[PDB]
Amino acid sequence: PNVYPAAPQGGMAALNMSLGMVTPVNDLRGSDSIAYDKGEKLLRCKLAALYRLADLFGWSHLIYNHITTRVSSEQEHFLIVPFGLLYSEVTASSLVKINLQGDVVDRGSTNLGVNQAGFTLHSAVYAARPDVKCVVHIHTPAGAAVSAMKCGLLPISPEALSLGEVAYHDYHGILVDEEEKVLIQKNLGPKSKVLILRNHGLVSVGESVEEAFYYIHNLVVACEIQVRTLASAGGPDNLVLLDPGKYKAKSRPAWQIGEQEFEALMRMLDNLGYRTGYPYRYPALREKSK
Amino acid sequence: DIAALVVDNGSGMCKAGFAGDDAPRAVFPSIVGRPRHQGVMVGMGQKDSYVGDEAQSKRGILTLKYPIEHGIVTNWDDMEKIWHHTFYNELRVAPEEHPVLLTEAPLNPKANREKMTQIMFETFNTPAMYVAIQAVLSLYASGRTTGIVMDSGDGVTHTVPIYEGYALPHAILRLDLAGRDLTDYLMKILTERGYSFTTTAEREIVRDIKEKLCYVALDFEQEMATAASSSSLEKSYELPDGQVITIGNERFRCPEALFQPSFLGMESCGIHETTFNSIMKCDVDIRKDLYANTVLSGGTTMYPGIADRMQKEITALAPSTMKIKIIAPPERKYSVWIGGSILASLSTFQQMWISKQEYDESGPSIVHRKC
Amino acid sequence: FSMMTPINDLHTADSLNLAKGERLMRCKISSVYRLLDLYGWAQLSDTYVTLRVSKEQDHFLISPKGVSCSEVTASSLIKVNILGEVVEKGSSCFPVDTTGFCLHSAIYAARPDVRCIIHLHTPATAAVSAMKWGLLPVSHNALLVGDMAYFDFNGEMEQEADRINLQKCLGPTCKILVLRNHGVVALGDTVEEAFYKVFHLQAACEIQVSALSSAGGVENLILLEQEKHRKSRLGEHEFEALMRMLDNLGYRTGYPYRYPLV
Amino acid sequence: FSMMTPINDLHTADSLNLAKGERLMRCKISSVYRLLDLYGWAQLSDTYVTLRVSKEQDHFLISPKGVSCSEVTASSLIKVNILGEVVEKGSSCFPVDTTGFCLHSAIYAARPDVRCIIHLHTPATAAVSAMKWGLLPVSHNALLVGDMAYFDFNGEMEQEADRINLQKCLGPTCKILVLRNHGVVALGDTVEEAFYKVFHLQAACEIQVSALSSAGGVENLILLEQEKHRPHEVGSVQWAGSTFGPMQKSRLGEHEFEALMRMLDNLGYRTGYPYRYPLVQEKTKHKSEVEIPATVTQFVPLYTDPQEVLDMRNKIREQNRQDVKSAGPQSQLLASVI
Numbered sequence A: 001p002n003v004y005p006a007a008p009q010g011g012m013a014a015l016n017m018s019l020g021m022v023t024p025v026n027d028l029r030g031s032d033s034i035a036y037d038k039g040e041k042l043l044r045c046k047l048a049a050l051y052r053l054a055d056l057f058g059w060s061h062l063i064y065n066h067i068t069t070r071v072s073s074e075q076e077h078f079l080i081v082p083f084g085l086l087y088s089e090v091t092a093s094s095l096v097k098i099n100l101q102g103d104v105v106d107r108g109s110t111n112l113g114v115n116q117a118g119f120t121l122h123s124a125v126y127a128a129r130p131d132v133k134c135v136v137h138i139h140t141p142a143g144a145a146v147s148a149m150k151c152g153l154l155p156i157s158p159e160a161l162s163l164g165e166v167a168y169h170d171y172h173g174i175l176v177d178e179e180e181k182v183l184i185q186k187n188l189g190p191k192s193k194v195l196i197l198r199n200h201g202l203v204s205v206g207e208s209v210e211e212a213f214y215y216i217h218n219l220v221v222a223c224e225i226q227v228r229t230l231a232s233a234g235g236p237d238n239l240v241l242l243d244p245g246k247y248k249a250k251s252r253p254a255w256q257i258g259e260q261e262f263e264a265l266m267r268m269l270d271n272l273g274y275r276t277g278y279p280y281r282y283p284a285l286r287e288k289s290k
Numbered sequence B: 001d002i003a004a005l006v007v008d009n010g011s012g013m014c015k016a017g018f019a020g021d022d023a024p025r026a027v028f029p030s031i032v033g034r035p036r037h038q039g040v041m042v043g044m045g046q047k048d049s050y051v052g053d054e055a056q057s058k059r060g061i062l063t064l065k066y067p068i069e070h071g072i073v074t075n076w077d078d079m080e081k082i083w084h085h086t087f088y089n090e091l092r093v094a095p096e097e098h099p100v101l102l103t104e105a106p107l108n109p110k111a112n113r114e115k116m117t118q119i120m121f122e123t124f125n126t127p128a129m130y131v132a133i134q135a136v137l138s139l140y141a142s143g144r145t146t147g148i149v150m151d152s153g154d155g156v157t158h159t160v161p162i163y164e165g166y167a168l169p170h171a172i173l174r175l176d177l178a179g180r181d182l183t184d185y186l187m188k189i190l191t192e193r194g195y196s197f198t199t200t201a202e203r204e205i206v207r208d209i210k211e212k213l214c215y216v217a218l219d220f221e222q223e224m225a226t227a228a229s230s231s232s233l234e235k236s237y238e239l240p241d242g243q244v245i246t247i248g249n250e251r252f253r254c255p256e257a258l259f260q261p262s263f264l265g266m267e268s269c270g271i272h273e274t275t276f277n278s279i280m281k282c283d284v285d286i287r288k289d290l291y292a293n294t295v296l297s298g299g300t301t302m303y304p305g306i307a308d309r310m311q312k313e314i315t316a317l318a319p320s321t322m323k324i325k326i327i328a329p330p331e332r333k334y335s336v337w338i339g340g341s342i343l344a345s346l347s348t349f350q351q352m353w354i355s356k357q358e359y360d361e362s363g364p365s366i367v368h369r370k371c
Numbered sequence C: 001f002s003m004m005t006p007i008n009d010l011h012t013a014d015s016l017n018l019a020k021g022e023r024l025m026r027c028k029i030s031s032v033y034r035l036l037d038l039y040g041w042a043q044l045s046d047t048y049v050t051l052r053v054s055k056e057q058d059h060f061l062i063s064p065k066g067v068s069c070s071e072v073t074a075s076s077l078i079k080v081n082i083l084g085e086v087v088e089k090g091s092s093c094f095p096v097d098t099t100g101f102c103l104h105s106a107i108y109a110a111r112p113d114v115r116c117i118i119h120l121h122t123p124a125t126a127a128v129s130a131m132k133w134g135l136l137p138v139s140h141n142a143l144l145v146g147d148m149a150y151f152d153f154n155g156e157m158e159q160e161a162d163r164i165n166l167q168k169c170l171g172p173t174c175k176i177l178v179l180r181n182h183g184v185v186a187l188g189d190t191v192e193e194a195f196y197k198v199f200h201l202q203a204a205c206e207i208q209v210s211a212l213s214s215a216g217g218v219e220n221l222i223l224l225e226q227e228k229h230r231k232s233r234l235g236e237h238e239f240e241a242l243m244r245m246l247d248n249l250g251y252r253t254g255y256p257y258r259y260p261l262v
Numbered sequence D: 001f002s003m004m005t006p007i008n009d010l011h012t013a014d015s016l017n018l019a020k021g022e023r024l025m026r027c028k029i030s031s032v033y034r035l036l037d038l039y040g041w042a043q044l045s046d047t048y049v050t051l052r053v054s055k056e057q058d059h060f061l062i063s064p065k066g067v068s069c070s071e072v073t074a075s076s077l078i079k080v081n082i083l084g085e086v087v088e089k090g091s092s093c094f095p096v097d098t099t100g101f102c103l104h105s106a107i108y109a110a111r112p113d114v115r116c117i118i119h120l121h122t123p124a125t126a127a128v129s130a131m132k133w134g135l136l137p138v139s140h141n142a143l144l145v146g147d148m149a150y151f152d153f154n155g156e157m158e159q160e161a162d163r164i165n166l167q168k169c170l171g172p173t174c175k176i177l178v179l180r181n182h183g184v185v186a187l188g189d190t191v192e193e194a195f196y197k198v199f200h201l202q203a204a205c206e207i208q209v210s211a212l213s214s215a216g217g218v219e220n221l222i223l224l225e226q227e228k229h230r231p232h233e234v235g236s237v238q239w240a241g242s243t244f245g246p247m248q249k250s251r252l253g254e255h256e257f258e259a260l261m262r263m264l265d266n267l268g269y270r271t272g273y274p275y276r277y278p279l280v281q282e283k284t285k286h287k288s289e290v291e292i293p294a295t296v297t298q299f300v301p302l303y304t305d306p307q308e309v310l311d312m313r314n315k316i317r318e319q320n321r322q323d324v325k326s327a328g329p330q331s332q333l334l335a336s337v338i
């Protein structure tokens, strides 16, 4: 079966599994990896797998949003999806390595170009913080609902309180270059790994891909909690609130942060047959046996 | 009220009756007799040839020959004589007023159907006639549309499976092991007792003996041991001349050639193995129903104990999880005609009749177009 | 298990007559219908998408009645005139009914520049159209939609007064028409424009209904104003990308790409 | 594309020390994890479902950390003591973390009646728990939920004061514990009853969320009260089964669990759950008058030469040609007299 049968409301996910069957993401082979770096080869795997995983959960809105990662092997480089190709068809070799200013370092496997306007915000965030290596910008249907609301995010769920401090950026939407960039830069100071745009969507930064995915998934879950909680009562009927610092104090060779859920989802993606090629801390579900 | 006619033909028996009736009107053997002795008696009744029930009365002065053997006609003129006797002497109805329904074996040469259709339109001016499969009509007489049927006549034995009213042509199995060959074998094994039968009338006498005093053994070796060690399995037949013979051991020996053809030396397998192979040739999904519905047809399957032995032999070859049951209607001799009496009575069957006028532009091959 | 249905099968028939680039553009409509089935927006037969063939002699393409959106092919479309009478029926053995085409015919009689019309009955747009506030500028996609006019709907366009009311309600320049208690209608110069506008409109409607159910008050939401907002193809890249997956998956679409891609 | 995973690999692995009843308990408690995965209420393990093995020795079945609900098998689950130390480890190579078990232990020290615990983190249940009001009796499912207790949860259950406060406020006879801003906890004597209550809470939570979203205010919902009538839900599950005797008597969640578990067995999930009510498909029976009942319920030696026979007849025919005179054999009695 080239195409899986479609649910009444889940056809796009079924096509995502079908395209996972048809086109593997580990496009790099032994002969096809000539004149290519090792760390970049490792990072393209994670980035392409993240693009493939983003469309499955529904956090993909055509080609308007982008997910960027930073490789600090050379002086100055970044990776991004080419413009004009959706999330469900992204492979490791099809990703484009570009400069901070948007200059295309190498064309890559694909022929299509790169959008500078989408990369402007990512460039602003990357130039603002040197420690940030991954930026994920998504637009879920509940996230723009909570973002356009006056009060903003509320400490209603432990997922919301796991985010800690959150930054807010007002949507003026004039997008004239450098001064928009500097408003982005000093509207998000030190730390504050989660940024909320008032109308465009949600964005999370992270030192690694796994940590950024964990933060954005916590933000999405907390948003889904917050919408249903505040829909019933929106004011003097006091929904139960927790102190952030005080509940955080009571919340309180080891496994790294964010790798557990990411590796479990890689176990999904390999069980289906996407052939992700993600490096596994524990490649076997069960023990050694024979 | 014009009603169709159902005429069932088999080697040794011809039946005929009006459609929609419970009983056929005429049943008589398909025999043709010609005088053999010097006829010297001026002024009294002599004829060139005797046919039907009248010929069987005068077996002493006649040579009796069958026009059909193994479901294939040998002399068409004798077949015309039998058909004329059936249409005129037995039913006393005009053949050109009522439609007639005819039956035949499933696997047969090309020329038989064409010659039969040509004779039936040209000689008798039949306005409409149709050809049907015998075993399919027997299954319709049982009243189930699915199952595998075994029809064993005096000409040939055949098992066909029918699923949802369709008989699969690839799964049809035909074995040339009939009751006339059993009669010949019974004559050969009665030779060793001291009684000798050679003429054709003596063959009919041996056939009557077989019909009256034969049965099927459940266990062959145990019945041989019982018959050798005791005289309980002995019956006496009383010949038409007053002589008395003792059938003795041979009663279960003649029908056992149905299950083991090595007695006759035939290469083919037994009848139960033939039914099992015919079931094997079908698809798996329907096999359950083929093991669930099996009916027996034909006069050869009237031997006592045929159903128990058939069920045991099929269960031996069947898987252990399968359920085997055998259906044996008491009127299994005349099932086929009964099915014909069903098939002509339906309101959708009047369009199934072959048109007389359409045959004029089509020709003798028209049945292959319509049947 | 029947396999997926090919979208372009007009080569198999080779009996219907063709005019100009119809061999291409028929397929476009089929793609749009398939796209609806990929989004769960509509899976039951209705007059959703109609297309004008040429600027002259007023020929239009509509979907046959009783055919679900998954089974629409290129050769199954129905060609009618402005009056709705069948001119060239498609290769679909179904009875024909054109009572739902009349509103689209009125819109076509209003604007000669309007070519493609998209109508949807999804819960978000129906809730927004039933709402007296209409579409609110509380999302980025709502600003991307543009400006729309609101029209009270009785349900039938056979009356002349309702027709002239529709022309004086639509105005000279408008691309989105909101029918009260019935939904939204997207107008486009091409199929790409109509698809892009209706997709952004539904995204904006979902955001608006979610935020308005969450807050419980209109003044609880922040309000954006139009002052900040106020080759050369608005919406061909997105539809071409969806076309690229459709061709890579196995759908035998006849769309020619603008660039040689890989 | 192979999402089937065998849920009972105890016989295949043969590398574990099982207790008197582990063979049934492990499959029974992995089945509910699979059902939680299929309903989509939870996909990433936060130690949702815990089981108690025996009353004489307090051992508890918990899921290993870092294992998704799709990957849960019966042999992969581990058993721990009430303190939290590992007694016997499953056949899963993962670091052991029993941090989330302690709250479940806070249930086990209080009530000896409860045996299985399910914790829910679904958006609807968390919306109802975070709501100022509780589960409002506005639906039939909420009436079938029954009485319930609310408690404030603050992330730790390790000091003695929080544990004794929870055990005091939980009460002697309560089945549902609502943790504020965290979700719901269902207590069960049996796994089927607790899964039944989990399903009814999820349905009632979704109903309440939709209802309070639809109408601004509680007074518009014209809610009924459970207390005024005080029914005993008598007369439910009237049965007219043919194989067994017709009785009203059934447990709270057996009949719903049997069908789900037979669903799981049909595809190929090799579960070891014993069905209390056996099921047989048989072909239907006929009572048409057409149907007829069935009648019953060396001679030649193996090594020889034809050329020998030909040479023998040639030897005889040669004597015929020669015509040599020779008398016949004579008796020995006549040989004596000569």
Ligand SMILES: Nc1ncnc2c1ncn2[C@@H]1O[C@H](COP(=O)(O)OP(=O)(O)O)[C@@H](O)[C@H]1O
Residues within 6 Å of the ligand: B009, B010, B011, B012, B013, B152, B153, B154, B155, B179, B180, B207, B210, B211, B212, B298, B299, B300, B301, B302, B303, B333
């Ligand atoms: N009562 C009976 N018991 C045993 N065998 C019988 C009996 N009647 C007929 N037969 C056998 O069946 C044969 C007749 O079969 P029949 O049904 O006439 O075949 P068809 O009609 O197909 O020619 C006879 O040769 C005879 O040996």
